[PDB]
Write a structure and sequence with these properties.
The structure is a homodimer. The first copy, chain A, is of the alpha/beta class and about 850 residues long. The first copy, chain A, folds into 5 domains: about 350 residues, Amino acid/polyamine transporter I; about 60 residues, no CATH class; about 50 residues; about 110 residues, Rossmann fold (3-Layer(aba) Sandwich); about 150 residues, 3-Layer(aba) Sandwich (Rossmann fold). Chain A has 24 helices and 15 strands. At the A-B interface, helix 15, helix 16, strand 8, helix 19 and helix 20 of A face helix 15, helix 16, strand 8, helix 19 and helix 20 of B. The complex binds a molecule of 3 linked components (NAG-NAG-BMA) (2 copies) and 2-acetamido-2-deoxy-beta-D-glucopyranose (2 copies). Chains A, B: It comes from Homo sapiens.
C-alpha cells in the first residue's frame, strides 16, 4: 500500500511546498512594494527574507536527516527530534500562523473581488471606512462559506488543489510573457497627469481641458472636476489647473525605455500626499486640494514593507507535510524543500526587476489600480489581457483559504491527541472519519477575529510574527542540541553546521524585532510559558511530582549526558568517599573525619559518606534508618555537603569492600577514599581491627583510587578554630608527586588553614628535582618555598625508617600538619604486622599525619 | 576595634545613601523636566522611578537579612547570597554604572561653571557646537585633575564628604525657604516678552520699544535687535515686532498666584520652536525669525524625560557600602535604606509641585537660564540669593565626582581579587595601601569615553541603563531562588514576598526597554555572556572540565535541591532495579529481563541494572570491567536508558543483598526490584539456586520495595515483534490493588503491547469491589472491562491452589500475559520448599506470568 503513494522528491515535497509558498502577496502587493521602495531596497527585502527562509530550510533538513522520520506531518518529526517541549511550542506557534494565514487569504480574495472584479456591488455605498465595512461583512460571509465547505467535503479540496496550482503557474508565466512582449510592442494604457500631479482616470475620458463636441469646444469633464462651471462660461478654475498642464503619459513604457534608472529610489511618502512623478514639468503654486488626486494610501516605511512582504515566503514546513508518503525522506525532503525555495526566490527576484523596468514609477505606488482605469497593476503586464490574472489570483486565493482551513485544525487535533498539553484535550475530539469537529470551530473563531481587522496591511505583520517565532524555535533547538552534545542528536547532513542554524536564528530574530518590538516580546513570553508548562506537565507525568519531579528529571538528564563522554579529565580533583566507622553504640566513632573532609573539599564537589553496620539486614532495618539520620545530622553539623549511604553487611570488611566499588551513580563516581587511621591497633588484643585496615588498603589500591589515611585525627582542628601561623610540611618522598603537591593548596584555600605557610621537604639528583619543583610552583602562582634535602630486609627497613624519623622530626617536629607519602602493603598477607610496624615507626613523633597513597593516573 | 565604628542605622547607612542619591539632576534638570512635562506627568515620572527603586530596596533588604552579612561592600553580600555568577554580573553592571556616573557628574560641574558662574571664560568663542567643544576640553581638564586628586590623597576626600553633604542639604533648605517666602513677598525677576513669543534678556536692558534718553525718545536696544536702523530713522521693523507688543511679565509669581492651573499640561515642543506662553495676547503674522527668540533646546518626549531623570534616584546600593561597620546589619540596613529612599522621594515629589506652582510656565522650559538675565532657574527660588545654590551645586557635583572615582576602582579590584573572572586578574594589582593602581587607569579611560559625549542629556540614558540592569538582576535572583526553593535561601524579612521582587523586576525591566530597546538588548546579551562565562569558569575550576564539569555541577545541584524535600510523592511510579544474573561465562543469562524492563518503563524514568559477580575483588577487577562493558552493550541493544553497577562479591546472596539497599545516589533511589524467576529450581540438584531467590524475596519485602518476578521470561516478546490482539489478564487477588491496576496501563502505553486489550479477572463482596473497580476505571479514561468472579494447612493450600489454577486457566488459558498477585514467603525458613511448590502449582499452565508483590505504601 505504501509503495503506490511513494513519490519522488518532486511530486512529494516540491509541489506541496511550491503550491503553498505562492500566495496572494506576489500579485496584489509586489508591485506596490517595488514602487514605494525602489528596486534596490526591494531587492534587499526579498534577499533578506529568502535568507532567513533558506537557513531555516537547512536547519529543518538537519532535523529531517536525524533519526527515523515519523509517519506524521512535520509536527511529529519536530517533536521526535526536539523533545515534546519544543514540539508543542512550535506546534502552537505554527498553528496560530496558519489560522491568521486563512484570515489574510480570505481578506485577499474579498479585496480582489470587490476592488477589481465587481466594484458596483458593495454592502456600503460610496469613503475608506466604507471599504473596511464592505470587507468586514463580505469577509465573514466568505468565512462562513469556507467553514461550511471545509466541514463537508474536504475530498473535493484535495481533488482541486492541482487546479489551484495550475492557476498560479499560468498567471506567473503570463506575467513573464507580458514583460518580454513589452520590449518591442508594449500595450496602450495611458494615464492623464496634471503637471507633476497624477490624476485618477476612473471617471475622466479625455486628458484634455476642452473636449470638442459637434464642432464646439465645450470644456471636458475634467474641467467639471476642477472647475464648477462645467460650461467654461467665465469659469473659475483653481490655481494649479490654470498654471500647470494635463498630459497623457504612457503608463507602461517599453522594457527598453530605461525607466529603471528613474524608479531606482525610495519614495516613502506618508499618508495622503499626492503621488508625483519627479520627471515632468510642474508649476509651484499650491492650495488646490482635489478629490481626483491619487493619494498615498498608507504612511509607508521600510520596516512596514518588510512586514507586509514576509508572509509570501512562509510555507516551507509544508514541504514535509506529506512525509508519510515518501521514499527516501532524509534524501527527498532536504533537496525538494531547498529547490522549491530556490525556485520561488528566483521568481520573486526576477519579477522585482521586471516591474521596476517595465511599469511607470507612478502606477506602482498606486495600491488600488487607480489611474489605469481600474485594472490590476501587474495585470497590465500580461499577454492575453489583465483578466486572466484578475481571475487566476482570485481562484488561487480562495483555494489557499480552503487549504489553510483544512490544514490548521488537523494540526490542532494532532497536538491535542499527543496529550502534551492537558487543557487542549477537549479539542482532541474527532469526527467519524477523524476530522477535528470541535477544533475547527476554534480555528474559525480565530480567523473571524483576524478578519475583523479588515486589511491585509495590518494582518500581515501578525502572521509574520507567528511564523517567525516558529522558525526561531526550530533554529534554536538545533543549535542548542548541537552545542550541548544532546543524546540522539545525529544530524546526518552534508552541509549542516551549527553556525548556520545560529545565523538563521539571529537573522530572523532580528526580523521579528524589526517588524514589531512589542509583538515580539509578547510572542516570546507566550512561547516561554507554553514551554515551561509543557516541561512541568511532563515532569508531573513521569516522576509523579511537579517540582520534585522537575529536579529529578534534570538530574537524570544531566547524568545521561554525562555518561556518553571521555572517562578521564584534563585536571585531577579529589572527589571524596569518607569512610566513617560506626561503633557498637551506632555513633560515629570519628567526627574529625568529617571535619577534615569538609576542610579538604571546602564545601564544593562530591562527598559520599559511607559506613558499614555489622549485622543482618532482615532485622536491623530500623537501626539503619536511625543511624542514617544520625550521620545526616552529623554531616549538617560539620558543614559537609554531600550524600550518605549505609550498607547493613554480615562482615565489616565485606561491607566496606562493597561500598568502595559500588558507591555513586554511574558518572558521579568518587575517586579517592578517605579513611581514619586504626589508632591503637597493637593495644587491642583482636587482630581483626588492624587486618581490616590492610584489607581496605588492598581494595583501594586495586580499584585504582587514591587513598588518604589520616592519623591522630582526634587532634585535627575543628571548623571554628583557626591557625595563626603554621607549616603544612609536604614530604614529596619518591613518586606520586601530583596529588601530594596539589593537596596542601586545596587545604590552604579554606579559612582554617588560610593563614599557614607551606614547606616542601623533598627527599644532586634532588637538585635535578629542585629545578622541576621550582617550575611547578612558578606556574601555579602560589607562595611556596621548596628545600631540597639530599638523600641516598626488615632490619634494613627499620634502620632506614629511623633515619626518616630523625630527618622528618629534625625538620618538621613542630609542623602543624605533616603530609607523607606511603609505602604499599605487602604482597604476602603474612608480613602485615611488619608492614603496620613500619608505618607506626615511620609516623612516630608526629602530632598530625596524613598518609597519602596515589595508586592511580593522577595528573 | 569594631565597636567604635559601630554606627546606628542613621549614621551608618542613612547618610551614605542620602549623600549618594542627591545628585546634580535635582538642580540643573528638575525645573526643565517639570516645565516641559507638566506637574502631572512629572509626578508620574517621579513616582514610577521611586517605585522601581523602592521594590529593589525591598529585594536588597531580603538579600541582606538572609544569612550572615560578609564584611565587604554590597558586592560581597550579593555574591554570598546569589552565587558568584550573579555576583559578577551585578558587579560589572554596577561598575560600569559608577564610571558613567563619574562622567555625568564631571559634565555637570563643567556645565554649571561654564554656563552660570563664568560665561566669559570659554575655550571656544561665541554656537551650540562651541559649547560642546568647550565642554569636551573643560571636561577632560577636570577629569585629569580628578584622577590626580583621587590617586594621591583619598583620605582628604573621606574627610570632606561631610562638607559635600552639608552643601547639598543647605541648598535644598534654601529652595524650600524661597518657595515659602514666595507666598507673601516674591522676588522681582522680570522677563521681556513680545506677544506670545518669549525674548531672551541677556542683552536687552528695558522691555520697551523706545528708551528715552536725555529727554529724547531714542529707540531702545531691542529695536536694534529687531530693526537694523537703530535710530528709528524710517526704521524697517519686521512683521511680528510691529504687530505684537513687548511686555514685562513677572517671572516668579506668588505661590498663591495660581499658575499651577496654567502649567498643568505637557508641551513637548520639538527642537528649535520658540517657547510661547499660552496666556498672553498675540498676533498671527509669522516669518520674522530672530536670534533673540528663546528656543526649545532638545526634541523632547516622555520617554526622553524618564531617561534624563532616572540617574537621580540611583545609589541605594551605597546604603550597604559601609556594612562592615554596622551593629545589626540585617536590622539597620533595611530600615536605613528604605527610610533614605522615602526621604529623597518626599523631597522630589514636594519640589515638583512647588516648582509647578511658583515659577512661570516659560522660565521652566528654559534649559540654560536664559530670559532671567542668566541666573539658575531654581536659583531664583531661594532666600538669600541664587548664588548660594549656584555655588553649592558646583561644590556638591565635584565632590560626587571624586566620590565615584574612588568608589569605582575599589569595586573593580574587589571583583578582580575574587578570581571569579580570569582575564580581569591584571586589574587585581594594588598599591602599597591597597589602592587599585591599574584599575583606576581603566576607570579614567571609560570616564574619558563618556565625557567625549559632552552632554548630560545623552550620558544619562546610558548610566540609567546600566543601573537598571543591575537592579533587574538583583530582583531576578531573589525571585528565582524563592520559587525554586534554592538551598540556603532563607530571607528572614517581615515583608519580603517573591511577588514583590517579581513586580520590581517587571516594572524596571519595562523601564529599561522604554528608555531604549536597543541598549537594553545589548546590556542583556552582555550580562548573559558574562554570566555563562563565569559559570563555565567555575565549572572548569571545580570539576576540572568545561562541559563535562558543567553537566556534573548541574547534576550535583539538582540532587541536592532534591534532597531537602518530602520523601513521598503524590503519585506512585515504578523506578526499576533490573537484577541481571551473570553466568559462569560472564554473559547475561536473561536478556529478556532487559527487554521487558524497557517495555515497562518505555525508555523514560530511572533504570539501574545491578548484577553480582561471584569471586574475590582483588583479582577480578579486569573481569568486572569487561562484564560491565558487556552489560552496557546489552542495555544499548535493548533500548534501555539507564545506568549499570557491578559488585564483585564473595557470596552471590550477599552481593544482591547489598545491591538492593545501596543502589542509586541519595534522592535518586529505585523503588521496585525486577527479578527473573528461577526457572528449573527443582531440576537443579543444588538447593542454593532456589534458596537465593527466597533470600532476595525477604530482603525486597523488608526494604519495602515492590517486587516484580517475571516467570517464563524466555517467551517474552522482543522489542521488534508486536501483538496483533491479546489480553493482559490482571488478576486483582485480595489486596495491593494500586500497583496491579497501574502496571498494565504502563505496559499498554508501549507500541508492543499497544494493540492489546485488558481484562481484570477480579477474585456479593466482589460486587462491592465491582462498584469500586468501575469507579477507578471511569476516572482513568482507559478502555478496560472488569468482570467480577464471586470467590469464597499445606493440604488446604494445595487444594485451593488447584482451584485457583482451574479458574485462572478456564478464564485466561489463552491470555497473552497473566499478572498475578503473590503470597508472602514463610516466616520460618524451613517451609521454603513448600512455599516454592505453592508458587509453582499456582503458576502451572501459564505461558507468561508476572508475579507481583507490593510490600510498600503504593498509591
Ligand atoms: C512637484 O512640483 C512642486 C512645485 O515646486 C515641487 O515642490 C517643491 O520642490 C522643491 C524641490 O526643489 C522642494 O524643496 C525646495 O528646494 C529649493 C531649492 O533651493 C529650496 O529653495 C526650497 O526652500 C525648498 O527646500 C520644495 O519643498 C517643494 N515644495 C514647495 C512648496 O516648493 C515638488 O517637489 C514636485 N514633485 C517632485 C516629486 O519633485
Ligand atoms: C501664539 O500665537 C500664534 C499666532 O496665531 C498661535 O498660532 C496658531 O494657533 C492656532 C491655535 O488656535 C493653531 O491652530 C489653528 O486653529 C484654528 C482654529 O480654528 C484653525 O482654524 C487653524 O487651521 C489652525 O488649526 C495654528 O496652527 C497656529 N499657527 C498659525 C500659523 O495659525 C500660537 O499657537 C500661539 N501660541 C500658543 C502657545 O498658543
Ligand atoms: C504648459 O504648456 C506650455 C505650452 O505647452 C508650456 O510653455 C508650459 O511651460 C507648460 N507648463 C509647465 C509648468 O511646464
Ligand atoms: C498691543 O497693544 C495695544 C494697546 O496697548 C492693543 O490694542 C493690542 O491688542 C496689543 N496687541 C495684541 C496682539 O493684543
Amino acid at each position: 500500500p505504501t509503495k503506490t503513494p511513494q513519490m519522488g522528491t518532486f511530486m512529494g515535497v516540491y509541489l506541496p511546498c511550491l503550491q503553498n509558498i505562492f500566495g496572494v502577496i506576489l500579485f496584489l502587493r509586489l508591485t506596490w512594494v517595488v514602487g514605494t521602495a525602489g528596486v534596490l531596497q526591494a531587492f534587499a527585502i526579498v534577499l533578506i527574507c529568502c535568507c532567513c527562509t533558506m537557513l531555516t530550510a537547512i536547519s529543518m533538513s538537519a532535523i529531517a536527516t536525524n533519526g527515523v522520520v515519523p509517519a506524521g506531518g512535520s509536527y511529529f518529526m519536530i517533536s521526535r527530534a526536539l523533545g515534546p517541549e519544543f514540539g508543542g511550542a512550535v506546534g502552537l506557534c505554527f498553528y496560530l500562523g496558519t489560522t491568521f494565514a486563512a484570515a489574510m487569504y480570505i481578506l485577499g480574495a474579498i479585496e480582489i473581488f470587490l476592488v477589481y472584479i465587481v466594484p458596483r456591488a458593495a454592502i456600503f455605498h460610496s469613503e475608506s471606512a466604507a471599504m473596511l465595512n464592505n470587507m468586514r461583512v463580505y469577509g465573514t460571509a466568505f468565512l462562513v462559506l469556507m467553514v461550511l465547505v471545509v466541514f463537508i467535503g474536504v475530498r473535493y479540496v484535495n481533488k482541486f488543489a492541482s487546479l489551484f496550482l495550475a492557476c498560479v503557474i499560468v498567471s506567473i508565466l503570463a506575467i513573464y510573457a507580458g514583460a518580454i512582449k513589452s520590449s518591442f510592442a508594449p500595450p496602450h494604457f495611458p494615464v492623464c497627469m496634471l503637471g507633476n500631479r497624477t490624476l485618477s482616470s476612473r471617471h475622466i475620458d479625455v486628458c484634455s481641458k476642452t473636449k470638442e463636441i459637434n464642432n464646439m469646444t465645450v470644456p471636458s469633464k475634467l474641467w467639471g472636476f476642477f472647475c464648477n462651471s462645467s460650461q467654461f462660461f467665465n469659469a473659475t478654475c483653481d490655481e494649479y489647473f490654470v498654471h500647470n498642464n494635463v498630459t497623457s503619459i504612457q503608463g507602461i513604457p517599453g522594457l527598453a525605455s530605461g525607466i529603471i534608472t528613474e524608479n531606482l529610489w525610495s519614495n516613502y511618502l506618508p499618508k495622503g500626499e499626492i503621488i508625483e512623478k519627479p520627471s515632468a514639468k510642474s508649476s509651484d503654486v499650491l492650495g488646490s486640494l482635489n478629490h481626483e488626486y491619487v493619494l498615498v494610501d498608507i504612511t509607508t516605511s521600510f520596516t512596514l514593507l518588510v512586514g507586509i512582504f514576509f508572509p509570501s515566503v512562509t510555507g516551507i514546513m509544508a514541504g514535509s507535510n506529506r512525509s508519510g508518503d515518501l521514499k527516501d525522506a532524509q534524501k527527498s525532503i532536504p533537496i525538494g524543500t531547498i529547490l522549491a525555495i530556490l525556485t520561488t526566490s528566483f521568481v520573486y527576484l526576477s519579477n522585482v526587476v521586471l516591474f521596476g523596468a517595465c511599469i511607470e514609477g507612478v502606477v506602482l505606488r498606486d495600491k488600488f489600480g487607480d489611474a489605469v482605469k481600474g485594472n490590476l497593476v501587474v495585470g497590465t503586464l500580461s499577454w492575453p489581457s489583465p483578466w486572466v490574472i484578475v481571475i487566476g489570483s482570485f481562484f488561487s486565493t480562495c483555494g489557499a483559504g480552503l487549504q489553510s482551513l483544512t490544514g490548521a485544525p488537523r494540526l490542532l487535533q494532532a497536538i491535542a491527541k499527543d496529550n502534551i498539553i492537558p487543557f487542549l484535550r477537549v479539542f482532541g475530539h474527532s469526527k467519524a472519519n477523524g476530522e477535528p469537529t470541535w477544533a475547527l470551530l476554534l480555528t474559525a473563531a480565530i480567523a473571524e477575529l483576524g478578519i475583523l481587522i479588515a486589511s491585509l496591511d495590518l494582518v500581515a505583520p501578525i502572521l509574520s510574527m507567528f511564523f517567525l517565532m516558529c522558525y526561531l524555535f526550530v533554529n534554536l533547538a538545533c543549535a542548542l542540541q548541537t552545542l550541548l552534545r544532546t543524546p540522539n542528536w545525529r544530524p546526518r547532513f552534508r552541509y549542516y553546521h551549527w553556525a548556520l542554524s545560529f545565523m538563521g536564528m539571529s537573522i530572523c530574530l532580528a526580523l521579528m524585532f524589526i517588524s514589531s518590538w512589542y509583538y515580539a516580546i509578547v510572542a516570546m513570553v507566550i512561547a516561554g510559558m507554553i514551554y515551561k508548562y509543557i516541561e512541568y506537565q511532563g515532569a508531573e507525568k513521569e516522576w509523579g511530582d511537579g517540582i520534585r519531579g522537575l529536579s529529578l528529571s534534570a538530574a537524570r538528564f544531566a547524568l545521561l549526558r554525562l555518561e556518553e563522554g571521555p572517562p578521564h579529565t584534563k585536571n585531577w580533583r579529589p572527589q571524596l568517599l569518607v569512610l566513617l566507622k560506626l561503633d557498637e553504640d551506632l555513633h560515629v566513632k570519628h567526627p574529625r573525619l568529617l571535619t577534615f573532609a569538609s576542610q579538604l573539599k571546602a564545601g564544593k564537589g562530591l562527598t559520599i559518606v559511607g559506613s558499614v553496620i555489622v549485622g543482618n539486614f532482615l532485622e536491623n532495618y530500623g537501626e539503619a534508618l536511625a543511624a542514617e539520620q544520625t550521620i545526616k545530622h552529623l554531616m549538617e553539623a560539620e558543614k559537609v555537603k554531600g550524600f550518605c549511604q549505609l550498607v547493613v553487611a554480615a562482615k565489616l570488611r565485606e561491607g566496606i569492600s562493597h561500598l568502595i566499588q559500588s558507591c555513586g551513580l554511574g558518572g558521579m563516581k568518587h575517586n579517592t577514599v578517605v579513611m581514619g587511621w586504626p589508632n591503637g591497633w597493637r593495644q587491642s588484643e583482636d587482630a581483626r581491627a588492624w587486618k581490616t585496615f590492610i584489607g581496605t588498603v588492598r581494595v583501594t589500591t586495586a580499584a585504582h583510587l587514591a587513598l588518604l589515611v589520616a592519623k591522630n585525627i582526634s587532634f585535627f582542628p575543628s571548623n571554628v578554630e583557626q591557625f595563626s601561623e603554621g607549616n603544612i610540611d609536604v614530604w614529596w618522598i619518591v613518586h606520586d608527586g601530583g596529588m601530594l603537591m596539589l593537596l596542601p593548596f586545596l587545604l590552604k584555600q579554606h579559612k582554617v588553614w588560610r593563614k599557614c605557610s607551606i614547606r616542601i621537604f623533598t627527599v644532586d639528583n634532588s637538585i635535578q628535582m629542585k629545578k622541576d619543583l621550582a617550575t611547578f610552583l612558578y606556574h601555579l602562582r602560589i607562595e611556596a618555598e621548596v628545600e631540597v634535602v639530599e638523600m641516598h630486609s626488615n632490619v634494613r627497613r627499620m634502620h632506614t625508617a629511623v633515619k626518616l624519623n630523625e630527618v622528618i622530626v629534625n625538620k618538621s617536629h613542630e609542623a602543624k600538619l605533616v603530609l607523607l607519602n606511603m609505602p604499599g602493603p605487602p604482597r604476602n598477607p603474612e608480613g602485615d604486622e611488619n608492614y603496620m610496624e613500619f608505618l607506626e615507626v615511620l609516623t612516630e613523633g608526629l602530632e598530625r599525619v596524613l598518609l597519602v597513597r596515589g595508586g592511580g593516573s593522577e595528573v
